[PDB]
Design a binder for this molecule. Structure first.
Ligand SMILES: C=C1/C(=C\C=C2/CCC[C@]3(C)[C@@H]([C@H](C)CCCC(C)(C)O)CC[C@@H]23)C[C@@H](O)[C@H](CCCO)[C@@H]1O
Length: 254
């Protein structure tokens, strides 16, 4: 019912987050030529044995994810209040949310035109088959695609999109966090900003219930995180896999 106006502080928070995202997410994907080249071996059969023997798309995707983790770290550092946290808690939050924020932010390159993450010419267009060529199984990919479509259909404003990523990162319920209270205080400030923004700036019929739907996506991400971790473990058993990854990836998921 009540639709309070965004406070000056809440307006500043949104402005800061939009700016942080614009500085850490390049919509032209111009740095991609700097990653190890994507290689797509013939695997129409989806052979796990062949996929693991080659891991043809792993160097490229590992570089893409590593690059993205760096961007997420940069984004996180700009989240109002994040700097108030101890270095130890900052790292805990970053490592635990990295893959989740990558899945969220990737929605910007995801397209329902053909259910792919399109970052340019065919070379940088990623489909389910490209992810299997990196060593992952459909147990992760299919649910991930479903998540992308569900997120797409929420038609989030960029303001809502950046707030959701910030809320995802600043979560008090991450194993290893020391000052949960402070983290929750920061998250509540972000959550209240999001709730207020939706109530006074998001037109119907895709509003209000929108907050609940967004919070539900955060729960969905936890499941995807767990599944990705299980599969990363398997992938790491492959001899010489470390060289196909990056130091940052090895640490975050190791
Ligand atoms: C990275 C990103 C993109 C796409 C994300 C994809 C497409 C290919 C496969 C991935 C990467 C999934 C797999 C499951 C993760 C695999 C990781 C390992 C192999 C380590 O397990 C997770 C998200 C999937 C491109 C762009 O939108 C951002 C980037 C450009 C703007 O900053 C974003 O940040």
């Amino acid at each position: 019912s009540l639709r309070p106006k965004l406070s000056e502080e809440q307006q500043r928070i949104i402005a800061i987050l939009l700016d942080a995202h614009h500085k850490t997410y390049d919509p032209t994907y111009s740095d991609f030529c700097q990653f190890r080249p994507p290689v797509r071996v013939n695997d129409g059969g989806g052979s796990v044995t062949l996929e693991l023997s080659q891991l043809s798309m792993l160097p490229h995707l590992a570089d893409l994810v590593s690059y993205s983790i760096q961007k997420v770290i940069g984004f996180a550092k700009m989240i109002p209040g994040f700097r108030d946290l101890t270095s130890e808690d900052q790292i805990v939050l970053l490592k635990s949310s990295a893959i989740e924020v990558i899945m969220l932010r990737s929605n910007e390159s995801f397209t329902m035109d053909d259910m792919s993450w399109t970052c340019g010419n065919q070379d940088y267009k990623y489909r389910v088959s490209d992810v299997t060529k990196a060593g992952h199984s459909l147990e992760l990919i299919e649910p991930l695609i479903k998540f992308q479509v569900g997120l797409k259909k929420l038609n989030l404003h960029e303001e809502e999109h950046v707030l959701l990523m910030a809320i995802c990162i600043v979560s008090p319920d991450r194993p290893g966090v020391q000052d949960a209270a402070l983290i929750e205080a920061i998250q509540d400030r972000l959550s209240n900003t999001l709730q207020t923004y939706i109530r006074c700036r998001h037109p119907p019929p895709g509003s209000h219930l929108l907050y609940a739907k967004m919070i539900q996506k955060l729960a969905d991400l936890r499941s995807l995180n767990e599944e990705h971790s299980k599969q990363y473990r398997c992938l790491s058993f492959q001899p010489e896999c470390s060289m196909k990854l990056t130091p940052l990836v090895l640490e975050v998921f190791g």
